[PDB]
Amino acid sequence: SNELDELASGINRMAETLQSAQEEMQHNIDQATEDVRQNLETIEIQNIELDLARKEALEASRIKSEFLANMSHEIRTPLNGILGFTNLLQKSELSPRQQDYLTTIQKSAESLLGIINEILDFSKIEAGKLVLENLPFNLRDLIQDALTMLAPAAHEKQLELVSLVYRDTPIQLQGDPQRLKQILTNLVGNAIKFTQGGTVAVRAMLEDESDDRAQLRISVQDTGIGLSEEDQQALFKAFSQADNSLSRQAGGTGLGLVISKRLIEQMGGEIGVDSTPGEGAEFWISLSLPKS
Amino acid sequence: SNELDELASGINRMAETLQSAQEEMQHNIDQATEDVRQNLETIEIQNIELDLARKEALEASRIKSEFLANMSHEIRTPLNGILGFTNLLQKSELSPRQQDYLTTIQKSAESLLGIINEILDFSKIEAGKLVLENLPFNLRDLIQDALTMLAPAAHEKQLELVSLVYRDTPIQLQGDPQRLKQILTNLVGNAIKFTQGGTVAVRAMLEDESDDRAQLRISVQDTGIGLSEEDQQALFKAFSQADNSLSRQAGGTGLGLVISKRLIEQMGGEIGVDSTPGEGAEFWISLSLPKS
Amino acid sequence: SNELDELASGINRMAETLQSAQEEMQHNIDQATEDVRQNLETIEIQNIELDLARKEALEASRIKSEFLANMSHEIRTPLNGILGFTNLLQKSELSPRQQDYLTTIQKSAESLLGIINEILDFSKIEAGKLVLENLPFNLRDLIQDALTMLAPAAHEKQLELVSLVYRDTPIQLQGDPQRLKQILTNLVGNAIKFTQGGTVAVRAMLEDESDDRAQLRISVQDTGIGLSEEDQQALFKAFSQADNSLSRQAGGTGLGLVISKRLIEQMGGEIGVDSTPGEGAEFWISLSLPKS
Amino acid sequence: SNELDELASGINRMAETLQSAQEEMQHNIDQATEDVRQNLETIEIQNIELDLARKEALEASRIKSEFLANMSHEIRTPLNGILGFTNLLQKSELSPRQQDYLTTIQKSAESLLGIINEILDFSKIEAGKLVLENLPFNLRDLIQDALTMLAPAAHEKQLELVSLVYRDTPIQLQGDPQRLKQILTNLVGNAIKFTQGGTVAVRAMLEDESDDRAQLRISVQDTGIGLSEEDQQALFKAFSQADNSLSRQAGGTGLGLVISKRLIEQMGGEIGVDSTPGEGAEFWISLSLPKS
Ligand SMILES: [Ca+2]
Ligand SMILES: [Ca+2]
Ligand SMILES: [Ca+2]
């Protein structure tokens, strides 16, 4: 019976390895109930921290907007007193020299007013409460008026201001002509600061056109003809600093550039800075506007 | 009988049920590899969003601080032109009426200067770059000097400025006497605006005392003696608005109050507003300062 | 997860060891079908040899019985001629010496006749064709009649024949009185040859008793009173030779003793030889017989 | 977690079916240890009965041989007395008629002596103690001498004894001439008893021949010429009875025929009886013997 005891002990050896493998497989089931518990614990712990950080960022944006509006109002009170009493003095008997000093106080106070209006504008954009007007306008007239406003500053630095609206450019549009002019004056004004000589050229071009709307590109370029190597380096450095401030949005190149980006984005457009070594650098805006 | 064929067919019947159970158990293993993958995907997706929101909050605070400093600088340029040319006009031949208009433009511009100095101060506090001085000072002299500077504003509204430092109040302390004076002038200046008549009373009291430090409470109270029911309602309303702005911190009661709260908190102290119907309302600060 | 791939690969590793163990366990099942076949082959091979040896022993016994009966008949034919012509000569004119020679031939032929009658008796016993009579008998009378017929032979050797049936011995029995007398005359006749002097004593004793049957012991003892040491040695040697012939059954102590053992065994009894040095040796029979 | 509890309960349901299948498979292992035990118990029980029956058959043959030798001795004692006293009477003064009666008693006793000598011969053959001699002999002389010894018995019944050894029959052989003569005298002697008239013819023929040995056939035929229908029926009946006794081996046709068959078989030969209605019946022997 040498083979009969082998079958009786072989089945006991086979069943002993199955009880040892089931103890190893039960350890895997006991570890899967703990590993899944730890995962659904961290998904809900991290899910509540994401709701907290999301709520804190929305409150910091609401408070930033309120703070700026309150600061603008705090400055507006004494500024209105300066503007009011300057007008009263301007209507009185003064010498030509005394009137020159008042004209300077008036222009300084009017620029200060423009700054606190940008702070108020930015607080409204930050809150989403900025309403754009809906008025028909002439794009050629708009660019010419913005360039006439900046002609003293351009002639101060020995620069020429050139405007170019092409024949195929649709000029009878509809939107916010004062906010579009605010963007243009800021871009042209910045271009004047960035160059030592040459011409600042504004071009208005058509990109795409339909029966109801018109897609436009407006470029403010400092061509830099006759600029020395030092002035060429200074021009590209100034435009790259403005391109960095456009991405950063911290008011590095002035608050007007921050608002120019937020205004063009509200109109469903884009703003950027282009550059070519033997062509000079430029600002550009791309926007779609309906036709009159 | 025929027991050998029962063992040979019993093992085939047992192995047939294991192949059917392994098909059901393979479906559970194929579902556990997808359910665990979805969990470790969301734990790492949520973990990267928490790192992103943490980095975005730090950048929004750095940009808020830079924006305010740039805004302050932008206003300072035209403001100094107003201040400068107002001084030049004040040195010229003008009538008494013309000189009174200039004095008003000058006072308005000086208040505007104080506001943009606070904006610059707040941008330094917002960046954590505000360093407190370490100078010995006399607390009685400090409060008396702050009240002397606010005496014209208090006498303009027919109010009296009273100071009271008790005998047991330790006056020989050490810290930032200019920042503590900035808090006091703001609190007393706000108290002057909140009342139509009576006295603004400042009291300096000891709360707790040790060999090296002193815990103090300073209260700026509008007692409101002789105020009509309308002026009493207006006083409580003004102080409750200031208490709301203290909690909100959005510059509702002026930027000076926002700085007063941030400065007292930087010194390890507290600030609040107390009120009693037949006693008038007050501002209070609690702070600990070392002696000598 | 790291534990999910362990369950998917653990089931494949567990099933791989079952296919390897089933190959080893299939070798044990293939060996059990051969080891059981060899066992049921030898049980039927040995079972057919037991039927063959049983049939061969029955044929050897049938042939032995036929041979003895034929041997008896073969001798009877010439023996009857010797007996017939001896009688014819005895009825003729002969001298006293010639008549003594015939008397010797006659007695020799009569003893030869007695031998071939025992050979015929034994051939009937050997064939199982011996049917026992069923007659009531008196056991005391039976033993007395057997002893009367052996008194000449006992008195020839100077011996006494004694009989002893106890008071408690049931004498009214039923069976084969002629076959029981044949056993007794042979045992007493042999006892007469085995001793030189004394008495041959027959004792009939009860061993066990019921309402319908009686278990008896009959002993034929040569007491050996007055026997010399030489005659005592010769007596025990003669009885031990008869005890050997009883076990051997080869006719060593005569064919009569072979028939005595077969007859007592057919009656469901036993026969033996007992011995005690200072008591003489004896024959004994044990048998159960019903009562009249 | 609906699929996690399915894997934890599926492994418990799978292991429950394995414990139930192992209980059924353990019952098969517990039955195989009893079924194999019963088989090896009967193989050893039957193996010991085969050793017992084998030993009992060898002892029954040894005892049969001793019994026959003792039977022969038991008959020899009274027979020797008859022979002895018959010779003593034959040497005395008797009439011719008295001498004829003694001659008959003598011939009857001498035949009886021949029978008990055959019983002693058969007991030696039965014990395997019969050694065959190795002597050269003349087969023609052997048959002629056997026929000369049986001529008185043949002439008593008015029969003729004829011998015929062919020219191609090898007569110079080697073996046991006395045992071969014993077979021939018995066969011829039996043939004499089986017929009432005619000739008993012995023929010696060659069957097969080699350089060292010779295969022979010897026939003893009762031709039965001149036999009536009654004597022809009696002849075939006598020879068919002898043919039955040859197969049965019970001594039915005399012990001499039993010895004739055992002797021819010991020499590696055969013996039988042939018959043809119009030719008479015969005995035959076939045997191989070496030459010279
Ligand atoms: Ca370019
Ligand atoms: Ca009984
Ligand atoms: Ca005894």
Nearest to B32 among A32, A70, A94 (CB): A32
Smallest Cβ–Cβ distance between D11 and the set A1, A15, A25 belongs to: A25
Ligand nearest to the CA of C214: 2
* Cα separation, A19 vs A5, whole angstroms: 22
Q: Are C68 and C123 in contact (CB under 8 A)?
A: yes
How far away is chain C from the Cα of D13, in angstroms, using its nearest Cα? 16
Please indicate whether, in this complex, the C-beta atoms of A8 and D29 are within 8 angstroms of each other: yes
**Residues A186, A180 contacting (CB under 8 angstroms):** no
**Cα distance between residue C19 and residue C266, in whole Å:** 69
Which residues have a beta carbon within 5 Å of ligand 2, which is an ion? C 213, 215, 288
Q: Which residues of C183-207 are buried (b: 16+ CB within 10 A; e: fewer)?
A: bbbbbbbbbbebbbbbbbbbbbeee
One domain for residues A275 and A156: yes
Point out the domain boundary residue: A130, A159, A191.
A130
Instruction: Nearest by CB to D4, from A1, A22, A33: name it.
Output: A33
Sorted by sequence, the CB contacts under 8 Å of residue C206 that are 6+ apart come out as: C166, C168, C169, C170, C214, C215, C216, C217
Measured in degrees and rounded to the nearest 5, phi and psi for residue B170 equal: -70, 115
The answer to whether C275 and C154 are in contact (CB under 8 A) is no
**How many other CB atoms are found less than 10 A from the CB of residue D75?**
23
User: C41: which 2 tokens?
Assistant: 């082959």
Instruction: Give the CA count within 13 Å in the CB-facing half-sphere of C242.
Output: 29
Q: How far is CA B244 from CA A128, B237, B247, B259, B272, in A?
A: 24, 11, 5, 15, 10
DSSP three-state, residue B252: coil
Q: Could you tell me which of D82, A115, B211 has the C-alpha nearest to residue C81?
A: D82
Nearest alpha carbon to residue B18 among D18, A69, A251, D30: D18
- What lies within 8 Å, CB to CB, of D185 at 6+ separation is D146, D149, D150
**C231 close to C196: Cβ distance less than 8 angstroms:** yes
Give the tokens for residue C136. 């009531």
CA C213/CA A150 separation, integer angstroms: 162
A126 by DSSP, 3-state: which?
helix
Cα radius of gyration (chain B): 34
Question: Using alpha carbons only, how large is chain C's radius of gyration in Å?
Answer: 34
- Cα(C148) to centroid of ligand 3, in Å? 24
For residues C68 and C172, membership in a common domain is answered with: no
Paired residues of B287 in beta bridges? B216
List, in sequence order, the alpha helices (H) in A150-195. 151-156, 177-194
Q: Is B269 left (phi over 0), alpha (psi -120 to 50) or beta?
A: beta
Q: Under an 8 A CB cutoff, do C6 and A17 touch?
A: no
| Other Cβ atoms within 10 Å of B124 Cβ, number | 14
Reading the block at residue A8, the tokens are 């009786």
Q: Which residues pair with A199 in a beta bridge?
A: A160
* Residue B163 buriedness (CB in 10 A; 0-12 / 13-18 / 19+): middle
Shared domain check, A221 and A93: no
Rounded alpha-carbon distances, angstroms, from residue C241 to C244, C251, C281, C286: 5, 11, 12, 21
Say how far apart CA C75 and CA C68 lie, in whole Å.
11
DSSP 8-state assignment for residue B132: P
Torsion of CA A203, A207, A212, A213, to 10 degrees: -60
Residues in contact with B259: Cβ distance below 8 Å, sequence separation at least 6, in sequence order: B118, B121, B122, B125, B182, B186
Q: Closest partner residue to D35 among B3, B18, B21, by Cβ?
A: B3
- C283 forms beta bridges with C220, C273
Q: Which amino acid is at B69?
A: A
Q: Return d(Cα C280, Cα C235) in angstroms, integer.
A: 8
Q: Which helix (H) or strand (E) holds C270?
A: strand C270-276
D89 min Cα distance to partner chain C (Å) = 6
Measured N-to-C along each axis, helices D4-90 and C255-266 cross at an angle, to the nearest 10 degrees, of: 140
Residues, chain B, total? 292
Helix (H, G, I), strand (E, B) or coil at D268: coil
CA distance B234 to B242: 12
Q: What does the DSSP 8-state code read for residue B102?
A: H
Buried-exposed string A23-46: b where 16+ CB fall within 10 A, e elsewhere: eebeebeeebeebbeebeebbeeb
Question: Residue A60: which of B60, B112, B251 has the nearest Cβ?
Answer: B60
CA distances from D183 to A53, D180, D200, D256, D261 (A): 135, 5, 15, 8, 8
What are A163's strand-pairing partners? A202
Q: Nearest-CA neighbor of C31 among A15, A12, B16, A10? A: A10
Note whether D192 and D149 are within 8 A (CB): no
**Contacts of B103 by beta carbon, 8 Å cutoff, 6+ apart:** none
In angstroms, rounded to a whole number, what is the distance separating the alpha carbons of residues B47 and C43? 82
Q: Are C217 and C284 in contact (CB under 8 A)?
A: yes
User: Are B215 and B207 contacting, i.e. CB atoms less than 8 angstroms apart?
Assistant: yes
C-alpha torsion angle, residues C273, C279, C280, C281 (rounded to 10) = 0
Domain that holds residue C72: 1-130
Ligand in nearest proximity to the CA of C272: 3
Packing angle between helix B229-248 and helix B177-194, nearest 10 degrees?
A: 140
Are B38 and D17 in contact, with CB atoms under 8 Å apart?
A: no
Q: Which residues contact D40 (CB under 8 A, 6 or more apart)?
A: A1, C39
Q: Say whether A3 and C31 touch across the interface (CB within 8 A).
A: yes
Residues A110 and A219 in one domain: no
What the block records as the tokens of A38 is 């730890």
Backbone angles phi, psi at A215, to 5 degrees: -95, 120
**Pair A292, A173: CB distance under 8 Å:** yes
Token pair 């203290």 in the structure block, residue: B246
Judge if D82 and D155 occupy the same domain: no
> Can you point out the beta strands (E) in A119-237?
135-138, 159-165, 172-175, 198-209, 213-222
> CB–CB of A10 and C17 under 8 A?
no
Q: At what angle do helices D255-266 and D96-126 cross, to 10 degrees?
A: 40
d(CA B54, CA A89): 54
d(CA C174, CA C159): 32
C-alpha B176, offset from chain centre:
18
Which residues face D175 on adjacent strands? D135
Instruction: Measure A275 CA to ligand 1 centroid, in angstroms.
Output: 4
Pairing state between β A198-209 and A213-222: antiparallel
When divided into structural domains, chain D yields a total of 2
Same domain, C161 and C37: no
CATH number for the domain harbouring residue B71: 1.10.287.130
Give burial (CB, 10 Å; 0-12/13-18/19+) of C92.
middle
Burial class (CB in 10 A: 0-12, 13-18, 19+), D230: exposed
Mark residue C175 as left, alpha or beta (left: phi above 0; alpha: psi -120 to 50; beta: remaining).
Answer: left
End-to-end CA, chain A: 111
Token pair of B116 as six digits: 């943009």
Question: Rg for chain D (alpha carbons), in Å?
Answer: 34
Instruction: Give residue D91's identity as a one-letter amino acid code.
Output: K
For the record, the structure tokens of D274 come out as 């042939």
Query: DSSP string spanning D138-170?
Result: EHHHHHHHHHHHTHHHHHHTTEEEEEEE-TTS-
Judge whether A115 and B74 are in contact, CB under 8 Å: yes
Report H helices in chain C.
4-90, 96-126, 139-149, 151-156, 177-194, 229-248, 255-266
Name the helix (H) or strand (E) containing B81: helix B4-90
Question: Which of C24, C29, C38 to mutate: most A Cβ within 10 Å?
Answer: C24
Half-sphere exposure (CA, 13 Å, Cβ side) for D258?
A: 24
Partners of B138 in the beta sheet?
B172
Q: How far away, in angstroms, is A251 Cα from ligand 1 center? A: 24
Rounded Cα distance, B165 and A273, in Å: 63
- For position B247, which CATH number holds? 3.30.565.10
Show the tokens assigned to B261.
Answer: 């709260």
Using DSSP's 3-state secondary structure scheme, residue C216 falls into: strand
Return phi, psi of residue A228, to 5°. -70, 170
- Identify all chain C residues contacting D78, using CB atoms and an 8 Å cutoff: 108-109, 111-112, 115
Name the nearest CA neighbour of C78 among C55, C109, C124, C122: C109
With CB atoms and an 8 Å threshold, state whether B109 touches A82: yes
**What is the Cα–Cα distance from D260 to D242, expressed in whole angstroms?**
12
| Burial class (CB within 10 angstroms; exposed 0-12, middle 13-18, buried 19+) of A163 | middle
- What's phi and psi for A242, nearest 5 deg? -70, -35
Same domain flag for D85 and D149: no
Q: Are C164 and C32 contained in the same domain?
A: no
Q: Which of D78, D112, D130 is the last residue of a domain?
A: D130
CB C150 within 8 A of CB C189: yes
For residue D170, what are its two tokens? 């090898």
CA–CA dist D212, D55 (Å, integer): 40
Among C6, C18, C28, the residue with its CB nearest the CB of A6 is C28
**Burial of C88 from C-beta contacts in 10 A (0-12 / 13-18 / 19+):** middle
Q: Measured between alpha carbons, how far is residue C104 from residues D84, D88, D135 in Å?
A: 10, 11, 44
Instruction: Say whether C179 sits in a helix, a strand or coil.
Output: helix
Q: Which residues contact A186 (CB under 8 A, 6 or more apart)?
A: A254, A256, A257, A259, A260
Beta-bridge mates of residue B281: B275
Cα atoms in the Cβ-side hemisphere of radius 13 Å centred on A152 = 1
The SS3 call for residue A264 is helix
How are strands ordered across the β-sheet holding D198-209?
Answer: D159-165, D198-209, D213-222, D280-290, D270-276
End-of-domain residue from the set D112, D130, D148 = D130
Report whether B241 contacts B275 (CB < 8 A): no
Q: What ligand has the least distance to the C-alpha of C286?
A: 2
Chain A residue numbers touching D2 (CB-CB < 8 A): none
Exposure string over A104-139, b if 16+ CB within 10 A, otherwise e: bbbebbebbbebbebbbbbbbbbeeeeeeeeeebeb
Q: Which residues pair with C155 in a beta bridge?
A: none
Q: Examine the domain organization and report whether A15 and A104 are in the same domain.
A: yes
Q: Classify C109 in phi/psi space as left (phi over 0), alpha (psi -120 to 50) or beta.
A: alpha
Interface with chain C: mutation pick from A26, A28, A39, highest number of C CBs within 10 Å: A28
Q: Which residues contact B22 (CB under 8 A, 6 or more apart)?
A: C11, C15
> Strand C159-165 to strand B280-290: parallel, antiparallel, or no bridges (unpaired)?
unpaired
* CA–CA distance, D260 with D182 (Å, rounded to integer): 7
| Residues B96 and B141 grouped into a single domain | no
Cβ partners under 8 Å of residue B197, min gap 6: B157, B158, B159, B224, B226, B227, B231
Question: Counting Cβ atoms within 10 Å, is residue D276 exposed (0-12), middle (13-18) or buried (19+)?
Answer: exposed
Q: Are both C13 and C66 inside the same structural domain?
A: yes
Gap between the Cα atoms of D113 and D119, Å rounded: 10
Which structure tokens are listed for C191? 């006892």
Q: From residue D144, how far is each of B244, B250, D147, D151, D175 by CA, in Å?
A: 168, 166, 5, 10, 17
Give the pairing type, strands A270-276 and A198-209.
Answer: unpaired
In sequence order, what are the residues at sequence separation of 6 or more whose Cβ sits closer than 8 angstroms to the Cβ of residue B96? none
Q: Of A263, A60, A284, which Cα lies nearest the Cα of A187?
A: A284
What is the longest distance spanned by two Cα atoms in chain D?
A: 141
Of B286, B263, B283, B287, whose CA–CA distance to B273 is shortest? B283
Give the whole-angstrom CA distance, residue B255 versus residue B119.
8
Give dist(CA C99, CA C90) in Å, integer.
7
Q: What are phi and psi of B227, to 5 degrees?
A: -75, 135
d(C-alpha A253, C-alpha A240), whole Å: 11
Short-list C184, C186, C91, CA closest to C145: C184
What does the radius of gyration of chain A's CA atoms come to, in whole angstroms? Answer: 34
DSSP secondary structure string for all residues of C5-56:
HHHHHHHHHHHHHHHHHHHHHHHHHHHHHHHHHHHHHHHHHHHHHHHHHHHH
Tokens 């026959």 -> residue: D68
The chain A residue lying nearest D33, using CA atoms, is A4
Q: Which one of the ligands is nearest to A224 CA?
A: 1
CA–CA gap between residue C25 and residue C31 (Å, rounded): 10
Torsion of CA C106, C110, C111, C114, to 10 degrees: 170
- Could you give the 3-state DSSP secondary structure of residue D231? helix
| D62 token code pair | 């040894």
Chains touching B (at least 3 CB pairs under 8 A) are A, C, D
| Continuous H helices in chain D | 4-90, 96-126, 139-149, 151-156, 177-194, 229-248, 255-266
Nearest CA in chain B to D19: B14
Say whether both B35 and B143 belong to one domain: no
CB contact under 8 A, B14 and D13: no
A255 neighbors A118 (Cβ within 8 angstroms): yes
Longest pairwise C-alpha distance within chain A: 140
